[PDB]
Amino acid sequence: MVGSRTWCESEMLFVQPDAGTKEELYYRVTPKPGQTQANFNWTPHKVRFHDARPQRDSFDLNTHGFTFVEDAISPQLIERIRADDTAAVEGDYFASVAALVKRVTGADHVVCFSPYTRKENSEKGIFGQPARTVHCDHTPAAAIELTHKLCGEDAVRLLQSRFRAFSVWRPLVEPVLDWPLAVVDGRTIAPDDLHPVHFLRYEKKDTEPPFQLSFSETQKWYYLSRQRSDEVSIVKNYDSEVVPSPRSAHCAFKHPFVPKDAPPRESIDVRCLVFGGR
Ligand SMILES: COC(=O)[C@@H]1C(=O)C(C)=C2O[C@@]3(C[C@]2(C)[C@H]1C)[C@@H](C)CC[C@H]1C(C)(C)OC(=O)CC[C@@]13C
Ligand SMILES: O=C(O)CNC(=O)C(=O)O
Ligand SMILES: [Fe+3]
Q: How far is the CA of 151 from the centre of ligand 3 (A)?
A: 21
* DSSP state letter for 140: H
Please report which ligand is nearest the Cα atom of 127.
1
List, in order, residues 6 or more apart from 194 with CB less than 8 Å away: 136, 211, 212, 213
**Do residues 180 and 253 make contact, with C-beta atoms less than 8 angstroms apart?**
yes
Q: How far is the CA of 132 from the centre of ligand 2 (A)?
A: 9
Q: Report the atom number in ligand 2 closest to the C-alpha of 129.
A: 3
Largest CA distance in the chain: 53
Write the residue with the smallest CA distance to atom 11 of ligand 1. Answer: 137
* DSSP state letter for 227: B
Write the residue with the smallest CA distance to atom 7 of ligand 2. Answer: 131
Q: Compute the distance between CA of residue 22 and CA of residue 113 in angstroms, rounded to an integer.
A: 33
DSSP tally for the chain: helices H, then strands E? 5, 14
Check if 167 has its Cβ closer than 6 Å to any atom of ligand 2.
yes
Check if 118 has its Cβ closer than 6 Å to any atom of ligand 2.
yes
Write the residue with the smallest CA distance to atom 15 of ligand 1. Answer: 137
DSSP string covering 47-105, please? Answer: EEEEE-GGGGGG--TTTTSEEEEE----HHHHHHHHTT-HHHIIIIIHHHHHHHHHHHH
Residue 145, phi then psi, degrees to nearest 5? -65, -40
Q: How far is the CA of 141 from the centre of ligand 2 (A)?
A: 20
Structural domains in the chain plus CATH codes = 7-275 (2.60.120)
Q: Compute the distance between CA of residue 187 and CA of residue 171 in angstroms, rounded to an integer.
A: 26
Q: How far is the CA of 137 from the centre of ligand 3 (A)?
A: 5
**Do residues 163 and 180 make contact, with C-beta atoms less than 8 angstroms apart?**
no
Technique employed here was X-ray
CA nearest neighbour of 246 among 238, 234, 256: 238
Check if 164 has its Cβ closer than 6 Å to any atom of ligand 1.
no
